[PDB]
Design a protein around this nucleic acid. Structure first.
Lengths: 76, 103, 80, 93, 98, 97, 82, 94, 104
DNA sequence: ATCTACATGCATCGGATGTATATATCTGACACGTGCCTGGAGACTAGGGAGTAATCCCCTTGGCGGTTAAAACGCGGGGGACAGCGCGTACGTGCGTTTAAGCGGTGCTAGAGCTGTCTACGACCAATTGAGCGGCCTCGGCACCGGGATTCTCGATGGCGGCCGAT
DNA sequence: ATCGGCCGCCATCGAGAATCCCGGTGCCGAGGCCGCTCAATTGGTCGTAGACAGCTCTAGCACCGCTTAAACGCACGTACGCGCTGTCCCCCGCGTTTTAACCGCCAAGGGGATTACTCCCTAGTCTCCAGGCACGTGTCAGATATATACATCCGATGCATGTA
């Protein structure tokens, strides 16, 4: 029952942290999720599934890749 | 007879005739067909024993070719000798790679 | 070119299952037919030469065994 | 019309190891094909062995060297023992 | 309905046909193939019943051994499916085809 | 301060040593290896000079052919590096085991 | 009482043989694996050659012994006779 | 020393037949000699088994032709049979 | 006079006749068999020497070396199939590099 | 917004599959007995291959001092090994219909095969001489070296198009 | 935002290390020559392998007709093929230090190599005959069958989770 913020807000803070013009890769987000926040085994699953949602609604923007395999950048 | 004298079941006399008529050499030694009969009997006994174990393991009183294939490939020594020979109606040893089985 | 198509899909599927493969690609069935025709052609090439040497018009089982023996793959049980 | 085979002798050795074991007709043919190959293999190598050393006779000594080359170490060790043992008993009486 | 997933029945097929020694190729079409191929080298060929069977026994053994060797190539590639690439590799290493 | 990329000197060595027929294994250590192993089967063995040369030619040929088959296995795995997995695979398909 | 002379096969030597084979990159574990394979091969080959030598009642192993042994192994060698 | 038979002279004549201006090293000559010896033992053994398979007590010219068709690839066997049968005709002619 | 000249071959037909009788191949040797073999050996020997000869002239060296012999056999499909079981001493390897290894 | 109520992942249980196990019985191939015959054992003689001792002498083993090419060691890091997303679709599975294979008929006869006859062929052999090989020696093709000529490799450097976060 | 600003991706130029192509030159070894000799050749003789005609009679080819079981066209869709990409440390480049292969010469004798001499070993021949094979005739082990026993496999239900 570890306490940690939103998974829609945790991937948002990890894209803001490292400023890369190509973007912040999803796998790097995880390292920021389990080093700045207390998460469990289920983290990697929902991090992938969090990318599934806010990618199609317009919250996130694809840059070089497909789905949660490539990279992305937080839409303005 | 000479088979009883050598203490072998395989016919040394028959082996002697084929060695003289088989164009292997001009003359055939007296102890060569005896040696060969012993060698032939030993190898046949080895094959027959592993195949004999294979017949009782299948709960069958009579040995079939399936038992022959199983004996050679499961025996390290026997598989190396016969590696170049395919046994008719032998099938393959039941082997399945671990990568195909699901979690 | 007519009966080489006689080797059916489920026949090839069973042989590969005995080989131990779970799934088979679609292009494999034709590749095997080519290899088998070539294989048979070589073996039959050697077997027919044995048959022609004995001046017979009938191919004995002894022809296949010797042909296989020359190719390096020896077959047991047929007049070995 | 008459045609010789090893069928009888193979069956006797079969009854020596396992008395309670038959043998289908197909497997007996397999055993016969197996026997012909072993003869031809060792004898050819023995022939080449006699031909390599410029000897005009194939002796019991030629058979032992050929066996050590073809068979694996353990099988070769055991096969040489039975062979040399049988030759001594044959030259006895 | 009771519909099974893919590959389990295949695995059951693996065990079934590895346990069985019966010939997996239909007899008559292979014979006609033997007739067809043999007609290239010689015409009006007669074939013993045991002669065609020897060709059939040898063929299935050769092909099956290749499929085991082919399976290993596919598995070495981290693949569960066999492909023509595995077959061509195995034959090249065998020495049949250069 | 000149440095070649990673994957060029190796290739130049490939072309270099494929064009040359010279023996790539040092002669003296191979002879001593032959003596030690041969000492297992027999003691105080004499070896012809032409005999030792024959062993080195056959060995390098066997290994080179093997290295082509091993290279093909590594490439078939979508790999540029050879690994023991490729060696064990190549020998298994060969029938040596 | 093994003086292992198999370590006498150096890393760059194995590197050169693989270059002649046509490989671009070599794993670190290959060097030990090759020494094992080479030891087994020579052990088998030397076993057969020495058996030919013992059959000829010589205390010296001729090159002809290696040629016959290799021919039986399936690898036939040209240039040293036969 | 004792005189030891070889195939060096006959190989050298054929060398001048194909290439008059070209030579060969001693090692390569040994390779050619080993190759020739191998071919002899190979064809003759297969021919010996052919006489034994067909229950013949003599090895004739007909057995050698069949053995060549078995061992050699298609193109080389066709041509090799032509040269063989041609040389035999010329031998029985003189 | 001699039988090698009568058959029109350089390879010794007389030697082949002697070798066929003493090689334990059969009880009797045909009259045309040693002639046939000599023709076959000369033909096969001629093919290897010409392809190796072209390999020698391609290297700007008249004298044939084992390297030239290996190149001739392995580049010929028929010859490679025949000699697949034979290793040529000092032959080296054909300079071959798979295209996947070269950078781009 | 909070409460209710859907999509998702990994164990527990269910019938429902094809598998396995069994008794009983149909059957044809394995097991058993006999005359027939030519192939194995026994006798005997001949002779030549081989064991053996003696001698020759080619060559294998053992040695050492120097050069220097090869190897071993080490560190840096490039790009190749590797799991995941995921998008994609080719497979497998399971139906109904479709094809013709397997079985069981005998008829016909091409063609394998045993046989008797004896002629063409090659083993056997003695005298013979040259093809062909052991030794020797020249010299030109070739391995080698220095050099420039030339392909190829890759950091350095200016140019440029897509997109942040800053002034 | 319009932006100068600024990390990403790009292409021709320019060392600069490497292979190539040139003549020059030194040297081992191919290629021509010669004498010893042993083996290819030839002429002569018989025995028998085998070429070949004719007879025996088996077995391969053939059409005939049904009986299912294997083959077939199809629909539905699910696990996996497989490029893209991310991320991590394996292994190339290669400089520096270290190690011992390689040379070259050669000292010594083990033992391969050959010769010569004595005789046991083995084919050949002849007579004798029994082990072994063709064949007629038997019944039990096992293929087949339908039933009972049961081993997997996947739908089915569920606490478990934060979800929008």
């Amino acid at each position: 029952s570890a306490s940690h913020p939103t998974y829609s807000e945790m991937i948002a803070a990890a894209i803001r942290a490292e400023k890369s013009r190509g973007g912040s890769s999803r796998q790097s987000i995880q390292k920021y999720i389990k080093s700045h926040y207390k998460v469990g085994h289920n983290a990697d699953l929902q991090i992938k599934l969090s990318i599934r949602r806010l990618l199609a609604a317009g919250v996130l923007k694809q840059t070089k890749g497909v789905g949660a395999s490539g990279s992305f950048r937080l839409a303005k | 007879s000479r088979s009883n004298r050598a203490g072998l079941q395989f016919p040394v006399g028959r082996i002697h005739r084929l060695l003289r008529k088989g164009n292997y050499a001009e003359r055939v030694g007296a102890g060569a067909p005896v040696y060969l009969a012993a060698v032939m009997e030993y190898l046949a006994a080895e094959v027959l024993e592993l195949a004999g174990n294979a017949a009782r393991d299948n709960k069958k009183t009579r040995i079939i070719p399936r038992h022959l294939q199983l004996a050679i490939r499961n025996d390290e020594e026997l598989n190396k000798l016969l590696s170049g020979v395919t046994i008719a109606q032998g099938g393959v040893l039941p082997n399945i790679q671990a990568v195909l089985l699901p979690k | 070119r007519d009966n080489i198509q006689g080797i059916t899909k489920p026949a090839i599927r069973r042989l590969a299952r005995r080989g131990g493969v779970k799934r088979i690609s679609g292009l494999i069935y034709e590749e095997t037919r080519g290899v088998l025709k070539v294989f048979l052609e070589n073996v039959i090439r050697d077997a027919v030469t044995y048959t022609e040497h004995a001046k017979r018009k009938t191919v004995t089982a002894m022809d296949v065994v010797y042909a296989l023996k020359r190719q390096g793959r020896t077959l047991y049980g047929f007049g070995g | 019309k008459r045609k010789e085979s090893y069928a009888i002798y193979i069956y006797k050795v079969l009854k020596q190891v396992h008395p309670d074991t038959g043998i289908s007709s197909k497997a007996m043919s397999i055993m016969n094909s197996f026997v012909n190959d072993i003869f031809e293999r060792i004898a050819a190598e023995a022939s080449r062995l006699a031909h390599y050393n410029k000897r005009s006779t194939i002796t019991s000594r030629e058979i032992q060297t050929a066996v050590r080359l073809l068979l694996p170490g353990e099988l070769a060790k055991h096969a040489v023992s039975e062979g040399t043992k049988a030759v001594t008993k044959y030259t006895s009486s | 309905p009771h519909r099974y997933r893919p590959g389990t029945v295949a695995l059951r097929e693996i065990r079934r046909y590895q346990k069985s020694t019966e010939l997996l190729i239909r007899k008559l079409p292979f014979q006609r193939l033997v007739r067809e191929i043999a007609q290239d080298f010689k015409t009006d060929l007669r074939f013993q019943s045991s002669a065609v069977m020897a060709l059939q026994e040898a063929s299935e053994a050769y092909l099956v051994g290749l499929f085991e060797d082919t399976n290993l190539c596919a598995i070495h590639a981290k693949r569960v499916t066999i492909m023509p690439k595995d077959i061509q590799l195995a034959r090249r290493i065998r020495g049949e085809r250069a």
